């Protein structure tokens, strides 16, 4: 019968290693698992064991991938046709695997002999270790677990290595496949789809296994790309074909990205850039003036009702707090900054937050969402009101945020359950507090010592406040009255966020009795203050506050050090508070110590207190704008930001602007009209993998557009054929692929000729050899290639049979080509055309078939061939799927042509075809197609216009309108993309590290050709050597430098080496050393040697770039999120990061380039992952960000004006 295999990935299941075979986050059944189950079925059928049965698989095809569920079981049916020697593997009656399988009757041990390498005796002592091998594999999308990690050693090119034999036939062969795909230059996931022949002989496999010193038997694997053969032990795979597997967007982590910027404690004029708020305020003022003498919002409606005319106000009170003006600061960064300040001055991660009068406050829908990005914050929010029913309408909302409920009138003392709160939030803009003094006392008592009060209110004497008072005529209080009341209840104002229309967020703190503070200056360059800090923090009984001071050395990293010390066991409540004076300009005078400013700071007792350009405040995180930045550029292309989404189509800045290597053999042509082809939308809808297109293409560039029309460098009207990137504002092509647009033609019409007519001429004339008077069968005759072939054939006086799928297409073809008769047309949507042809050729058939159809239509087209018939395959589905073609049509002297006009871009002879097309232009044989023109801004519409298939002729995106002034005589808003000129040298300090190598690869893919990688010890690992070798082989001038940036002379020398290659355009500080440990373990030398790679190194890089790099474009430093928020155990790391950030802010303030990226945990590569953080484990509440996401985030960050940006992934 049929063998049933119940694949269960359970712990006690005998097949549990399969959970370790993870590809793009989904547990996929290995392609070798099917081979193993078929082998078991065959062994059962022939009565032998698996280890006693040498086997041969042939023409194995994998039709679909089986996803193993987390829980449950997948049933696989294996059916053997022994007489046919074939097998079949099905999931639920759906074909999964097909091929042939049979016993190896005469096993050949000589088949399992390692072929000689094409480049032998490499003399390379460096090989890829198992950790490096699987780091590289995981970078490509292969999350293989420990069971599927059998490659314990590999050569730098992947042609040879060692495979660990764990008595598993699935894992061993899967590691063979990993070895085959390791040396592949292709990028991304590549899953096996077809394997020509697998020969497995366990008899020689046992004898070819040798045990190492670890007593673990291994085999030697050799991959010959020349022979296309992988041999390991007794396994020999030949003809393995791997097809690209798109990476699922579900596995794509969504990272939270913030900007880390300075904000003063007192802010005024907030929300001024909001035009809607200004318009609403103007309308309210006009309504108030009319009463004394957008518009659909609650406040304008109430004002209009009052103008028309108590009852109305009572009815509209519930919707009053939701007004945009009354909630402007509630939906503003000021509230987020105040919340961050509150959670910053906290004993531990616990956050006890209580809201007063939540019925009209509506702070339950913003505060927990705003504090959600905090990774380790434990939030306890309680919504309280005098009347519980007022919260009923918000009940469901209170269920969404897990907010507790309670009853408490502000005029009465708080309940004991609500006492000792950490944060108290009120929104009394609409709600009435009653007696301000009694209430203020009530939640002064309710708040614990050191707690924070955040109240959003309206100020009397202001437009919004005056309007509210007039409408309502306890009540609206002025700022002076509010401050006096705060002083009455012993509240110290630490924050002030005032809008333009008067609404204000007051932040107050309850003072805590503290002894005389100890002032510790942490500005010493020798880092001798760390010993004093350890000594003062060595005691636990004393709780006297310790104020860190950084009056000198404005580029001090005290912020990161303090943030890291807060969550340490020593100093959580010992008040490790800082005082930094970071003046971004020398014009602003500094704040003298021992004066009233320090007294005010102590009175506020805010943990983060920085003086910047006259302002007193702190560095806070803010949510980054979700919109991708756009710039006006003359060079842009069309890209699908998310694969398969036609709505994601956008104009992205191209690499043709920053780098313009105008040299003979290439030409920068301005694109006026670019046509869309079938391949473009097979790319844009995800049906065709971008890597399937031949050519050296990176994983970032878009391949939309194979042809274009427009102007040239000299301004002549030209049209062109390109392998890719033709859908752009400008295109770089050789003149070998250029034709001159004739005067009678329009640039719009000419943008339809290149691809279709070149393909028709190559298939018909070059390969088909269409002699005049012959009989042709042209499929999709209404298409582009079809119309071109019809025109050529009618020029040659040929009988033509065009297959079209519509009556309108028939009519258009008849009108366009009057030489075609009613018998010239058949149906392309069914096999029927075959009979039609076989009827009108007298059963002889057609001489030439221009076939773009597939499957049964392809077979019918083959059956239409006459004797000496030429079959020109223009389509690719049956070619790509390796569909069998019956080799009996060749008995009719038939020649089968696989016509692909894509080898002309990576090989020649193309000129012949070129000449033909030019001839067709001269004779009038080449006639422009019908063009459906879409504007450049509507490109996506065009992409979804002909994908429906109703288009006739060609669809053309009008990138630029043709000027009628002459035939010989462009800024657009495009998404900013980071591209680097080839004439600039880019330095990556620490570029040989984990993040360094991947950043170098990303920069190289972005156009960097002169690269300088700085390492303290040069190349040591096989992975580093392999990456450097690949970069050098592909043309990048990567240079490994031992020069250390920690010394000024070392930085100068490094910049000199970079300038030797070319002008310095980018400096990337990724150097880092780890001296992590608790503060009592910390030593001054540890801080010195940690800050030297990062702080002193960045200072030296700053100085040298200022003095010797006038053309610098990128000055990027990679800090950690430990500085932004805090991580216990690494205080020196945080100090170095914060100092780097201050350096970058100083650089950016003066106009020079500067960027500090506060990375969270990095997943694919790094240092913490390689040592002991396998896969992506929750580290400090932040998940390890994947490298692809890291590179996209860096690309986004590099095109922003913000000095310091942070990115991490929530757990």
Binding site for ligand NDP (CB under 6 A): 677-679, 755-756, 759, 780, 782-786, 804-806, 809, 828, 852, 874-876, 899-901, 946, 949, 989-990, 992-996, 1014-1017, 1044-1046, 1070-1073, 1093, 1097, 1118, 1120, 1159, 1161-1162, 1166-1168
- Cα 595 vs. chain centroid, distance in angstroms? 50
Q: How far is the CB of 706 from ligand NDP (least distance, A)?
A: 8
- Is 1039 annotated as belonging to a binding site? no
- Is 988 annotated as belonging to a binding site? yes
- Is 783 annotated as belonging to a binding site? yes
- Is 797 annotated as belonging to a binding site? no
Token pair, residue 581, equals: 């004076």
Please return the burial class of 440, using the count of CB atoms within 10 Å of its CB with bins 0-12, 13-18 and 19+.
buried
Q: Based on CB atoms, which residue is closest to ligand NDP, 196 or 806? A: 806
- Is 998 annotated as belonging to a binding site? yes
- Is 718 annotated as belonging to a binding site? no
Q: How far is the CB of 945 from ligand NDP (least distance, A)?
A: 10
Q: Based on CB atoms, which residue is closest to ligand NDP, 561 or 1161? A: 1161
Q: How far apart are CA 76 and CA 840, in angstroms?
A: 49
Q: How far is the CB of 1166 from ligand NDP (least distance, A)?
A: 3
Phi, psi of 400 (to 5 degrees): -70, -40
Q: How far is the CB of 1210 from ligand NDP (least distance, A)?
A: 16
Q: Based on CB atoms, which residue is closest to ligand NDP, 351 or 1073? A: 1073
- Is 1068 annotated as belonging to a binding site? no
Phi, psi of 1030 (to 5 degrees): -65, -40
Q: How far is the CB of 1159 from ligand NDP (least distance, A)?
A: 4
Catalytic residue among 15, 143, 159, 174: 174
Q: Which residue is nearest to ligand NDP (CB)?
A: 993
- Is 535 annotated as belonging to a binding site? no
Q: How far apart are CA 441 and CA 427, in angstroms?
A: 17
Q: How far is the CB of 804 from ligand NDP (least distance, A)?
A: 4
Q: Based on CB atoms, which residue is closest to ligand NDP, 218 or 1139? A: 1139
Q: Based on CB atoms, which residue is closest to ligand NDP, 18 or 1051? A: 1051
Identify the residue whose tokens are 């790099």: 1109
Q: How far apart are CA 710 and CA 700, in angstroms?
A: 26
Q: Based on CB atoms, which residue is closest to ligand NDP, 1 or 1017? A: 1017
State how beta strands 378-385 and 404-407 pair: parallel
Half-sphere exposure in the Cβ direction for 66 (13 Å, CA): 29
Q: Based on CB atoms, which residue is closest to ligand NDP, 594 or 949? A: 949
Q: How far is CA 511 from CA 443, 519, 545, 759, in A?
A: 14, 19, 13, 81
- Is 999 annotated as belonging to a binding site? yes
Q: How far is the CB of 1139 from ligand NDP (least distance, A)?
A: 13
Q: How far is the CB of 1096 from ligand NDP (least distance, A)?
A: 9
Q: How far is CA 195 from CA 240, 636, 1024, 1132, in A?
A: 4, 41, 32, 54
- Is 1000 annotated as belonging to a binding site? yes
Identify the residue whose tokens are 């088949």: 111
- Is 551 annotated as belonging to a binding site? no
Q: How far is CA 552 from CA 169, 590, 606, 758, 1090, in A?
A: 67, 10, 20, 71, 21
Please return the burial class of 59, using the count of CB atoms within 10 Å of its CB with bins 0-12, 13-18 and 19+.
middle
Who's near 122: CB < 8 A, 6+ residues apart? Answer: 155, 156
Q: Based on CB atoms, which residue is closest to ligand NDP, 563 or 677? A: 677
Token pair, residue 750, equals: 């000419």
- Is 779 annotated as belonging to a binding site? yes
Q: Based on CB atoms, which residue is closest to ligand NDP, 679 or 836? A: 679
Measured over all CA atoms, what is the biggest interatomic distance in the chain, rounded to whole angstroms? 111
- Is 160 annotated as belonging to a binding site? no
Q: How far is the CB of 678 from ligand NDP (least distance, A)?
A: 4
* Contact present, 133 and 154 (Cβ < 8 Å): yes
1076 is catalytic: no
Q: Based on CB atoms, which residue is closest to ligand NDP, 80 or 853? A: 853
CB atoms within 10 A of CB 740: 15
Q: How far is the CB of 1170 from ligand NDP (least distance, A)?
A: 7
- Is 55 annotated as belonging to a binding site? no
Q: What angle do CA 322, 325, 329 make, to 5 degrees?
A: 90
Identify the residue whose tokens are 């504002």: 729
Length of the chain: 1211
Cα–Cα nearest to 1002, from 726, 1189, 727: 1189
Q: Based on CB atoms, which residue is closest to ligand NDP, 683 or 992? A: 992
State how beta strands 55-62 and 190-200 pair: antiparallel
Could you tell me the strand order of the sheet in which 546-549 lies? Answer: 518-521, 546-549, 576-577
Q: Based on CB atoms, which residue is closest to ligand NDP, 677 or 1131? A: 677
- Cα 711 vs. chain centroid, distance in angstroms? 35
897 is catalytic: no
* Contact present, 346 and 511 (Cβ < 8 Å): no
Q: How far is the CB of 637 from ligand NDP (least distance, A)?
A: 20
- Is 986 annotated as belonging to a binding site? yes
Q: How far apart are CA 233 and CA 1207, in angstroms?
A: 46
Q: How far apart are CA 219 and CA 691, in angstroms?
A: 32
Phi, psi of 379 (to 5 degrees): -100, 135
Q: What angle do CA 552, 555, 558 make, to 5 degrees?
A: 85
Catalytic residue among 15, 20, 21, 1164: 21
Q: How far is CA 644 from CA 248, 632, 684, 1124, in A?
A: 11, 27, 5, 37
Any idea what DSSP says for residue 209? -
* Contact present, 1185 and 995 (Cβ < 8 Å): no
* Contact present, 458 and 505 (Cβ < 8 Å): no
Q: How far is the CB of 679 from ligand NDP (least distance, A)?
A: 6
Residues with their C more than 2.5 Å from the N of the next written residue in the chain, i.e. before a break, are 293, 309, 473, 907, 969
Contacts 24+ apart (CB under 8 A), 509-512: 509/345, 509/450, 509/451, 509/452, 509/453, 509/604, 509/605, 509/606, 510/444, 510/447, 510/448, 510/449, 510/450, 510/451, 510/453, 511/603, 511/605, 512/449, 512/450, 512/605
Question: What residues are designated binding site for NADP(+)?
Answer: 776-793, 985-1000
Q: Indicate the annotated binding residues.
A: 776-793, 985-1000
**What is the set of active-site residues?**
21, 174
């Amino acid at each position: 019968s049929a063998a049933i295999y119940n694949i269960d990935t359970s712990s006690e299941s005998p097949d549990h290693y399969l959970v370790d075979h993870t590809l793009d986050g989904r547990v996929l059944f290995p392609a070798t698992g099917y081979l193993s189950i078929v082998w078991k079925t065959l062994a059962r059928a022939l009565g032998l064991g698996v280890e006693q049965l040498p086997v041969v698989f042939e023409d194995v095809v994998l039709h679909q991938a089986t996803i193993l569920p987390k829980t449950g079981t997948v049933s696989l049916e294996v059916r053997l046709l022994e007489a046919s020697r074939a097998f079949e593997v099905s999931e639920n009656g759906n074909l999964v695997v097909s091929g042939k399988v049979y016993q190896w009757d005469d096993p050949d041990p000589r088949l399992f002999d390692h072929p000689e390498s094409p480049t032998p005796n490499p003399t390379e002592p460096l090989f890829l270790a198992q950790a490096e091998v699987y780091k590289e594999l995981r970078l490509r999308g292969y999350d293989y677990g420990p069971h599927f990690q059998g490659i314990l050693e590999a050569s730098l090119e992947g042609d040879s290595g060692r495979l660990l034999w764990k008595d598993n036939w699935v894992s061993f062969m899967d590691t063979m496949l990993q070895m085959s795909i390791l040396g592949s230059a292709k990028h991304g996931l590549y899953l096996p789809t077809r394997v020509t022949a697998i020969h497995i002989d366990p008899a020689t496999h046992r004898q070819k296994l040798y045990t190492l010193q670890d007593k673990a038997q291994v085999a030697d694997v050799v991959v010959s790309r020349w022979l296309r053969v992988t041999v390991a032990g007794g396994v020999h795979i030949s003809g393995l074909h791997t097809e690209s597997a798109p990476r699922r967007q579900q596995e794509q982590q969504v990272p939270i990205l913030e900007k880390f910027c300075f904000t003063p404690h007192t802010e005024e004029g907030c929300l001024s850039e909001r035009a809607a708020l200004q318009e609403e305020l103007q309308l309210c003022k006009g309504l108030v003036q009319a009463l004394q003498t957008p518009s659909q919002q609650e406040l304008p409606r109430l004002l209009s009702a009052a103008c028309r005319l108590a009852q109305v106000l009572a009815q509209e009170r519930p919707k009053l707090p939701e007004d945009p003006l009354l909630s402007g600061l509630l939906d503003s960064p000021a509230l987020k900054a105040c919340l961050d300040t509150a959670v910053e001055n906290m004993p531990s991660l616990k956050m006890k937050v209580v809201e007063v009068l939540a019925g009209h406050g509506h702070l339950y829908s913003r505060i927990p969402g705003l504090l959600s990005p905090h990774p380790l914050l434990q939030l306890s929010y309680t919504a309280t009101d005098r009347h519980p029913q007022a919260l009923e309408a918000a009940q469901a909302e209170l269920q969404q945020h897990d907010v507790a409920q309670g009853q408490w009138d502000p005029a009465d003392p708080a309940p004991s359950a609500l006492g000792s709160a950490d944060l108290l939030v009120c929104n009394c803009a609409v709600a009435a507090l009653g007696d301000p003094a009694s209430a203020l006392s009530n939640m002064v008592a309710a708040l614990r010592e050191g707690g924070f009060l955040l109240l959003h209110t309206l100020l009397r004497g202001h437009p919004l406040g005056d309007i509210v008072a007039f409408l309502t005529s306890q009540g609206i209080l002025s700022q002076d009255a509010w401050e006096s009341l705060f002083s009455r209840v012993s509240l110290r104002l630490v924050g002030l966020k005032k809008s333009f229309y008067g609404s204000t967020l007051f932040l107050c703190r309850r003072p805590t009795p503290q002894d005389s503070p100890i002032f510790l200056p942490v500005d010493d360059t020798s880092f001798r203050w760390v010993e004093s800090l350890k000594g003062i923090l060595a005691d636990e009984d004393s709780s006297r506050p310790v104020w860190l001071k950084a009056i000198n050395c404005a580029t001090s990293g005290v912020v990161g050090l303090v943030n890291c010390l807060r969550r340490e066991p020593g100093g959580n409540r010992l008040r490790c508070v800082l005082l930094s004076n970071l003046s971004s300009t020398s014009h602003v005078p500094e704040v003298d110590p021992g004066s009233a400013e320090l007294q005010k700071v102590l009175q506020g007792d805010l943990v983060m207190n920085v003086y910047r350009d006259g302002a007193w405040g702190a560095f806070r995180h803010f949510l980054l704008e979700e919109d991708k930045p756009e710039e006006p550029t003359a060079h842009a292309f069309v890209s699908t930001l998310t694969r398969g989404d036609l709505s994601s189509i956008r104009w992205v800045c191209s690499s043709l602007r920053h780098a313009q290597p105008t040299c003979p053999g290439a030409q920068l042509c301005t694109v006026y009209y670019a046509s869309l082809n079938f391949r473009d939308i097979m790319l844009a809808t995800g049906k065709l993998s971008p890597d399937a297109i031949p050519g050296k293409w990176t994983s970032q560039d878009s391949l939309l557009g194979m042809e274009f029309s427009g102007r040239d460098a000299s301004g002549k009207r030209v049209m062109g054929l390109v392998p890719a990137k033709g859908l752009a504002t400008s295109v770089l092509l050789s003149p070998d692929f250029l034709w001159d647009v004739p005067s009678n033609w329009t640039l719009e019409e000419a943008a339809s000729v290149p691809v279709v007519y070149s393909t028709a001429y190559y298939a018909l004339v070059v390969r088909g050899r269409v002699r005049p008077g012959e009989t042709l069968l042209i499929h999709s005759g209404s298409g582009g290639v079809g119309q071109a072939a019809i025109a050529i054939a009618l020029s040659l006086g040929c009988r033509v049979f065009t297959t079209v799928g519509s009556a309108e297409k028939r009519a258009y073809l008849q009108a366009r080509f009057p030489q075609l008769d009613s018998t010239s047309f058949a149906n392309s949507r069914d096999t029927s055309f075959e009979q039609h042809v076989l009827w009108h050729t007298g059963g002889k058939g057609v001489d030439l078939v221009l076939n773009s159809l597939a499957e049964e239509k392809l077979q019918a087209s083959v059956r239409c061939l006459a004797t000496h018939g030429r079959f020109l395959e223009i389509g690719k589905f049956d070619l790509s799927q390796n569909h069998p073609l019956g080799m009996a049509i060749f008995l009719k002297n038939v020649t089968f042509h696989g016509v692909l006009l894509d080898a002309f871009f990576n090989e020649a002879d193309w000129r012949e075809v070129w000449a033909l097309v030019q001839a067709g232009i001269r004779d009038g044989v080449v006639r422009p197609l019908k063009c459906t023109v879409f504007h450049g801004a509507q490109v996506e519409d065009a992409f979804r216009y002909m994908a429906q298939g109703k288009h006739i002729g060609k669809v053309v995106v009008q990138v630029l309108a043709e000027e009628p002034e002459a035939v010989l005589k462009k800024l657009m808003s495009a998404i900013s993309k980071t591209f680097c000129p080839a004439h600039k040298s880019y330095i990556i300090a620490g570029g040989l590290g984990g993040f360094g190598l991947e950043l170098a690869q990303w920069l190289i893919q972005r156009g960097v050709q002169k690269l300088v990688l700085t390492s303290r010890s040069g190349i040591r690992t096989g992975y580093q050597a392999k990456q450097v070798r690949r970069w050098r082989r592909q043309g990048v001038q990567v240079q490994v430098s031992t020069s250390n940036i920690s010394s000024l002379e070392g930085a100068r020398g490094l910049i000199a080496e970079a300038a030797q290659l070319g002008p310095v355009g980018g400096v990337f500080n990724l150097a880092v050393v780890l001296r992590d440990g608790l503060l009592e373990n910390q030593t001054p030398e540890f801080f010195q040697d940690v800050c030297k790679p990062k702080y002193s190194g960045t200072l030296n890089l700053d100085r040298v770039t200022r003095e010797a790099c006038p053309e610098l474009d990128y000055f990027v430093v990679f800090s950690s999120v430990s500085c932004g928020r805090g991580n216990a155990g690494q205080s020196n790391y945080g100090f170095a990061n914060s100092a780097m950030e201050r350096i970058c802010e100083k650089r950016r303030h003066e106009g020079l380039p500067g960027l500090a990226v506060q990375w969270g945990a990095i997943g694919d590569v790094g240092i913490l992952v390689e040592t002991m953080s396998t896969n992506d484990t929750i580290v400090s509440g932040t998940l390890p960000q994947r490298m692809a996401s890291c590179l996209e985030v860096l690309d986004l960050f590099l095109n922003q004006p913000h000095m310091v940006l942070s990115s991490f992934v929530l757990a």
